[PDB]
Design a protein around this nucleic acid. Sequence first.
DNA 1: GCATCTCGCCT
DNA 2: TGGCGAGATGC
Lengths: 116, 116
Amino acid sequence: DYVICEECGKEFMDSYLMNHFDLPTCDNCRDADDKHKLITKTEAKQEYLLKDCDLEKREPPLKFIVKKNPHHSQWGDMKLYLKLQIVKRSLEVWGSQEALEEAKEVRQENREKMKQ
Amino acid sequence: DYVICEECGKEFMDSYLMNHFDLPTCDNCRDADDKHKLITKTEAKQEYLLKDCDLEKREPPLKFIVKKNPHHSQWGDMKLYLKLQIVKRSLEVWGSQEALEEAKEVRQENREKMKQ
DNA sequence: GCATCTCGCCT
DNA sequence: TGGCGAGATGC
Ligand SMILES: [Zn+2]
Ligand SMILES: [Zn+2]
């Protein structure tokens, strides 16, 4: 029930980041424009090389906010994840900073060879 | 812990179908060649128009056995599901037999028109 | 932007 | 008597 903000170390029980994601970060220590900045599913997946199974099966499975696309209401709603959890999930799916670069570098190697 | 086999209506607690799938059917009532017959994920999906999420996300999420492809060890393992559960998961996702048939007919319309 | 849909290899 | 990648378009 009652929880320790990772950040300020204070107790809290109810946070926007603890309701919507299970992130022990009290709303005072929330950074909705910086560390607590969101990302679309797609950018996430292309910017960190993350299978939907890496998001949704891997434990704990990350959660997201639905939003309406801008003046694009005829299209499907955006799945906004917290960028912070993607960063870490990635780090734990790739195991390193270096391995993400290396694999995307190897990824480009094929993309050019796929079409070459 | 204890359960009622849907089929004979007797109490049981342990079953091959109740351990592997959550199917209240005692191993006496078990038809592993017919009603308790299994199908690979691919045929399941292509025979009954199911998305991976219709299998995995839709509560209750269906489970499966892993098996070794015939002399095809070089490849990815088979996920055998139970055919029954898919026949139902399908029915609920498509609502009716009339709505499976229709939708695969409307499917073939576009497959043709996709190439035309 | 995202969730489908076929495809060339089993990293 | 099979499943996983990965590229280009509705939505
Ligand atoms: Zn705090
Ligand atoms: Zn029974």
